[PDB]
Amino acid sequence: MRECISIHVGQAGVQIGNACWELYCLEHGIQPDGQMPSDKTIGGGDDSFNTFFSETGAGKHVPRAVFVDLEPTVIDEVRTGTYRQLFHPEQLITGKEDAANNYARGHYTIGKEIIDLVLDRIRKLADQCTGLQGFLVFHSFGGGTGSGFTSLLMERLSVDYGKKSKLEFSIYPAPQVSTAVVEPYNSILTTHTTLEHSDCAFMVDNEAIYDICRRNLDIERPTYTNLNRLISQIVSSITASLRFDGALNVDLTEFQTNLVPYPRIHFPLATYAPVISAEKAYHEQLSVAEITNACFEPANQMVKCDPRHGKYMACCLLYRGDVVPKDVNAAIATIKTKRSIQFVDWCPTGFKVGINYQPPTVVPGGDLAKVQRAVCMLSNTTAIAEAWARLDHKFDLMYAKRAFVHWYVGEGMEEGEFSEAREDMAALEKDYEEVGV
Amino acid sequence: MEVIELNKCTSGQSFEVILKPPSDPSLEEIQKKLEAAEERRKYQEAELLKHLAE
Amino acid sequence: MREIVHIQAGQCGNQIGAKFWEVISDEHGIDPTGSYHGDSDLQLERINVYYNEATGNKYVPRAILVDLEPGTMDSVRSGPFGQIFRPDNFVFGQSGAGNNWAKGHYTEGAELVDSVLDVVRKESESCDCLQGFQLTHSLGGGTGSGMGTLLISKIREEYPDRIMNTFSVMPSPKVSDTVVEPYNATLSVHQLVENTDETYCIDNEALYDICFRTLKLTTPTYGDLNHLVSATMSGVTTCLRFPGQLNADLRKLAVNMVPFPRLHFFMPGFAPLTSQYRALTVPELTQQMFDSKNMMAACDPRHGRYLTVAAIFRGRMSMKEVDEQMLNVQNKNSSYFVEWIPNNVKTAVCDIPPRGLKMSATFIGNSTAIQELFKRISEQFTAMFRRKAFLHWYTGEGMDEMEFTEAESNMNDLVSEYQQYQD
Amino acid sequence: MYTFVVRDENSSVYAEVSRLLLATGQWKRLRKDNPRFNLMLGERNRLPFGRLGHEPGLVQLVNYYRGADKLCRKASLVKLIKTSPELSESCTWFPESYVIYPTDEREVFLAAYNRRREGREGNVWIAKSSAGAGILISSEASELLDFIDVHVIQKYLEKPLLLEPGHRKFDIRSWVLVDHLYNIYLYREGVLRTSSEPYNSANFQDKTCHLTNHCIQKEYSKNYGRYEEGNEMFFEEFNQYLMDALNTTLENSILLQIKHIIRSCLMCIEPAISTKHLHYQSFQLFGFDFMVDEELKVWLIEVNGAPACAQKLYAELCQGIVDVAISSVFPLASIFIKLHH
Ligand SMILES: Nc1nc2c(ncn2[C@@H]2O[C@H](COP(=O)(O)OP(=O)(O)OP(=O)(O)O)[C@@H](O)[C@H]2O)c(=O)[nH]1
Ligand SMILES: Nc1ncnc2c1ncn2[C@@H]1O[C@H](COP(=O)(O)OP(=O)(O)CP(=O)(O)O)[C@@H](O)[C@H]1O
């Protein structure tokens, strides 16, 4: 067993992390007070769930997580929430004033003053680890802390933990819920400085989650609570292999090996099905073939794009519930004859499949209905570069006029870092086009 | 359609299906950049105070 | 605990500032004696942004009242909410400023500014994390204009990393007290261009036309004008006073509204404006909110382009229908929004509506059409300055004609800067 | 009111469509780089499909199918027909073609060539590509490969149907409109682009009688406009000719094969280009070009992704584009034959 440390940065990361750990506890049978009746090894052990939970002599299971935000209002909700007892104060780090949606303010001005403290609180959790695998970093692209401070943290983690893996869960900005005009700036700035320090990053576009909530859950105006409960389901399906017995994606290193043959192209596309509304008594349970076929519908992807007009480098299928390999292969065979699925020539045309018999757990009283079987597809397709194109275009529109640039220069950032970051994205879009067209 | 490396356990199983075969900066360098940014802030603030002093 | 320090200076500044505290005090359930009597916890969740909590659970506005004459401030202390202000925060002289920017900025005002800063420092010291300052004042007088901009310059020197926000009332010959108002306004605007991050341009001409044309008030008074300002100030500060995601503090507001440092002069708007029991639909709020007749700066938005826009809807309404109508406005009139700032229109919704209204909407626009306001002031300035008329009032206080020439040039530069982004 | 943008100024078809949309009083044209549009008349090259369908509150429609280039390119079409089981290598309405690079099919092309040579069968082939105005028609294989030094070599139809009087060659242009629901609409009006020179099967060097291009006939042909105005014969005259001469109709002898060919090509790529469940919608106007041999068998020549219309038909067709493709998605306040499938 090897431990994994979760780091939640900014409002988006903290609120998403709070939703995930709530779901983790429900899946592992951990109660709000940290007690786990099914755990018979009191005060220790090297079970699969221990990769995310440590144990005290009193039997409390404490998440291996750190919450960081430059403003206390969001983390204070964790201090007084339903799962307040899970965490101890050393895990929650808050400042006095935030980064004001300013990457430079979160990275340089405020980041320089709090970075050493965060590393210290992380070093404490690492000291509890007998064989630390690495870190899962949750954050937004558009926020000043999620973008600015995260990149500084990722840089320092590569220094203090050179051999550890680092995976991201990143929130792509969507105007329908976005709160700042400069989020394209912060997105491209944080992606530039973080690119070399992240081994695998799962981008979630709020636009996609927003419409999935409106269309499949019948939410007229989805809130962050609606969005985060759905996101935590996706994240749970991705991390389930680290927390349960199995043989696929059993450690962080395997994520890169199975999904990232090219290091810079490390943004796998996530597709989840089925998303059923709990406001209907009965719904016809979807088969393995129907939920697997849904993994190739753009309407179910975490990022709206068209994989038909790209190429696959890898594809994993993560099933949860009543699923046997026989039905998976039969479903895949049918889908190949009907779907446009092109792989790169230097890659094998195949699917790595993982099945966990325990069906998905749903938050009691939430919006998602319990289902007999669900699947999350992790496919590394060049089509996800469409999200980079949209982001780079908006960047170009504002930066051509130098709009809002003075806010960043005023924090000590040089104007050259803008073009330097934009040129890196230009090479990134070029890599995707070379690989997929 | 080849099915390989089937692993079964009490809580599930995993396998692979092949449809077709194929055809950092140092801790010192980071500190300098953070300090360089802080120096540009101090310089800009000193200019403001100088301007206000006039 | 992101505290704001409020300052009101001069006759206009104190009369409008007093109405502002009367209005928001009612919204937060605070009575004249500072006692809370509300039925919602939202009233108190962010009460500390504008109020200090004293002994006995009293809430004391974090406000400083400044004036070179005692008259107007005596009326405030004797007003409806006069007792709610901290007595030590009344800082005033006896000479007055005679509607003279030089007196407020260089002579009479300089003698009193240090005592004001002492009170500001006392308030700031007891702030967990000071956001910044908001100043209410007019630009056509002497105290609010001349001494107000002097205070701003010295507040920036002592708090250079804090946000400065002002509600600045622009003079108009239609609602004028003296002929030198264009002089005082021109000298002040350059101070604002340099030393504020956000300025709501409240045009007395617009306030008059709205009271006369729309509200059907034949003989508008200053009190009538201040009714519109109170409602607008309450609207533009809703995101600061109640829980929310968008523009929740002064610095994030500036980041969303100011793409270029000098272009930070906003056109506020309010809806509805009824001359009154009829229910208002979300489509009606949106169209009225964007209608120039609801603008407070007397500028035609269709004569320029919107750099950024902040919209705040108050009351229990269809949030889905709000997004639809907001998207409808931008999609139908997209030509008036600069295309090089994607998604420059941000919308916020607050459940608590203003007093006497089921729902309302406040508009905050950074439009290049605001140059029409500065051109108007610039024309009135030159008409007199070309003959050096009325300058002796200012040279008598030590000022030189060169300082007027430089203020004139600075104003014309600001107009040219707006013009380059309008093409 | 609906909004649209124009990003291809050289499109005569959509220049007319834009002119029609404005005249309805219900459509407004924005700047070409304004993202808040309902409809995009996109550019021919590098149309940014990835930026469509990300505008809240706007149903967005584009006039091009992403991925339809596979059908509208010389080499792409050949590869698509040979490799797609729906069309298959045994396809009977597409001339025997081979992809030749200056993978490659040089050795397979020569293998079939030699078979025809020994069998005394006609061995005339044509080499062309997507970079033409330039073509070469030769009976010796060695001449074809030397000329190329991406191109496609396909069997030149040595026995075309010849219109009389004139003993001349022609090709049939069909306009097909596919809407957002993937309904295939065939414009009832076609055009025969005829050659004004008598077909001379002796010397293929004089291309004035072998190439039916409107431009070639208007510059290199001595009899341009002699038999029909602009070397363009419409279906009414052509149908009457088939009745008076061949004792048949255009519908039975030719149009059935054309409709069949249009269905097969478009249905083949439907899974790859359909925008049924996509965040944006697409429609597209296609230009199918056919050849008819003396046996009254129809052969597909190529498919145009950005075709131009005939002068006499711009009004009717462009108005049809608005009714079927645009108004169906954005209703306001049949000249097509629906090919069911
Ligand atoms: N899915 C999801 N997105 C969120 C959530 N909270 C904020 N966001 C998104 O994050 C972006 C803003 O960044 P934040 O995380 O809120 O800002 P921050 O990281 O706290 O940094 P600051 O500027 O200092 O406040 C916007 O695009 C929001 O839509 C959340 O709870 N769930
Ligand atoms: N295999 C073949 N057999 C007989 N004739 C052929 C032929 N291929 C081409 N032609 C003749 O050559 C002409 C030009 O062919 P092609 O369509 O490839 O060129 P093009 O793409 O430049 C014109 P367009 O874009 O309008 O179709 C055709 O109209 C046809 O008359």
Ligand SMILES: Nc1nc2c(ncn2[C@@H]2O[C@H](COP(=O)(O)OP(=O)(O)O)[C@@H](O)[C@H]2O)c(=O)[nH]1
């Ligand atoms: N809206 C409004 N404007 C005022 C009020 N009082 C004065 N003004 C305007 O302010 C200018 C006069 O400035 P004033 O505040 O009286 O001078 P000061 O006391 O020296 O700062 C003129 O343009 C007046 O029109 C008021 O109560 N409301």
Ligand SMILES: [Ca+2]
């Ligand atoms: Ca244990």
Ligand SMILES: [Ca+2]
């Ligand atoms: Ca590394």
Ligand SMILES: [Ca+2]
């Ligand atoms: Ca004195």
Ligand SMILES: [Mg+2]
């Ligand atoms: Mg924050």
Ligand SMILES: [Mg+2]
């Ligand atoms: Mg006065």
Ligand SMILES: [Mg+2]
């Ligand atoms: Mg062609």
